[PDB]
């Protein structure tokens, strides 16, 4: 059942990244698929995960 | 190449954490090492040493018993044991041929004498024997690493 579990997690990350638009933006710009906790934000506009 | 080069990068991390540069340390100076190790370095060395043998043998299985690694390498370019030492050959080049000689044991500099270890001594003097000697030297290096890791004394770093 870990296969359907990882399928569910893969469909969960598309929700974690602010929906389809945010997910596609992250995939195309940052070459990343995973979502981490926002540990901080600098003045210039970079999110630290 | 790449499988062991990840571990080599892990070595470079230790090099960076002790001296300050991952490759060119400038660490070991006359009168002892430059400065003490950072806290927690020994534990990370311990974990790496635990994990290393399981990939050393992994490299072995790919190369040691392979047909074409041996065939390209076994018994090509023999070097005679007598003709080896006159030619000024040294290190594994000697040990590959068969002379039982190693400065770490016969002329022990620093604390190499208190460290117990066997050396790999070659059989046929060929390319393959030297390669096997290098790998067995890996493993004896791991054993030496364990020994020095367990028994580092309290003291200063420079004279």
């Amino acid at each position: 059942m870990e296969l359907v579990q990882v399928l569910r997690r893969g469909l969960q990350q598309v929700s974690g990244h602010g929906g389809l638009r945010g997910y596609l933006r992250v995939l195309f710009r940052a070459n990343d698929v995973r979502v981490g906790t926002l540990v901080g934000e600098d003045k210039y506009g970079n999110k630290y995960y | 190449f790449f499988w062991m080069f990840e571990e080599r990068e892990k070595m470079f991390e230790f090099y960076e954490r002790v001296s300050g540069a991952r490759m060119h340390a400038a660490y070991i100076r006359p009168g002892g090492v430059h400065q003490d190790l950072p806290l927690g370095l020994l534990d990370d060395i311990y974990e790496f040493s635990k994990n290393f043998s399981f990939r050393i043998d992994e490299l072995e299985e790919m190369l040691t018993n392979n047909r074409i690694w041996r065939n390209r390498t076994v018994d090509i370019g023999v070097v005679t044991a007598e003709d080896a030492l006159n030619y000024g050959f040294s290190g594994v080049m000697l040990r590959g041929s068969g002379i039982q000689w190693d400065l770490r044991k016969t002329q022990p500099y620093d604390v190499y004498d208190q460290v117990e270890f066997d050396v790999p001594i070659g059989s046929r003097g060929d390319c393959y024997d030297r390669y096997l000697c290098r790998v067995e030297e890996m493993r004896q290096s791991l054993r030496i690493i364990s020994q020095c890791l367990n028994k580092m004394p309290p003291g200063e770093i420079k004279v």
Binding site: - | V79, T80, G98, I99, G125
Partner: protein, 115 residues
């Protein structure tokens, strides 16, 4: 010798199945060559001493394994190899003739090494 040892361990030389007579003949030859060498030379004294000692022990003890032990020269093959080298050395410097005094002194201060 029982089962003759397969390999000495050094690939540069093989096993001599009859080593005792080899020790004997090479030692006798180099003793002859030293007999050539004039008496006053210290080389003849030292080398005749060590070689007659070696010949005595090799002709005394006929077990090869103990022969290496009291010969402190490893396997008998590298021992007869070194004996051949000693023969060669004595023969080669027979006509080099080093027993003569020094050819000449070094020029003035040629060895002091604070500059």
């Amino acid at each position: 010798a029982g089962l003759l040892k397969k390999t000495t361990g050094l690939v540069g030389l093989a096993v001599c199945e009859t080593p005792h007579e080899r020790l004997k003949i090479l030692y006798t030859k180099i003793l002859d060559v030293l007999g050539q060498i004039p008496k006053n030379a210290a080389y003849r004294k030292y080398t005749e001493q060590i070689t007659n000692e070696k010949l005595g022990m090799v002709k005394a003890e006929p077990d090869v394994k103990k022969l290496e032990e009291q010969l402190q020269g490893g396997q008998i093959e590298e021992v007869i190899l070194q004996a051949e080298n000693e023969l060669s050395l004595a023969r080669k410097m027979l006509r080099w003739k080093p027993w003569e005094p020094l050819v000449e002194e070094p020029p003035a201060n040629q060895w002091k090494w604070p500059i």
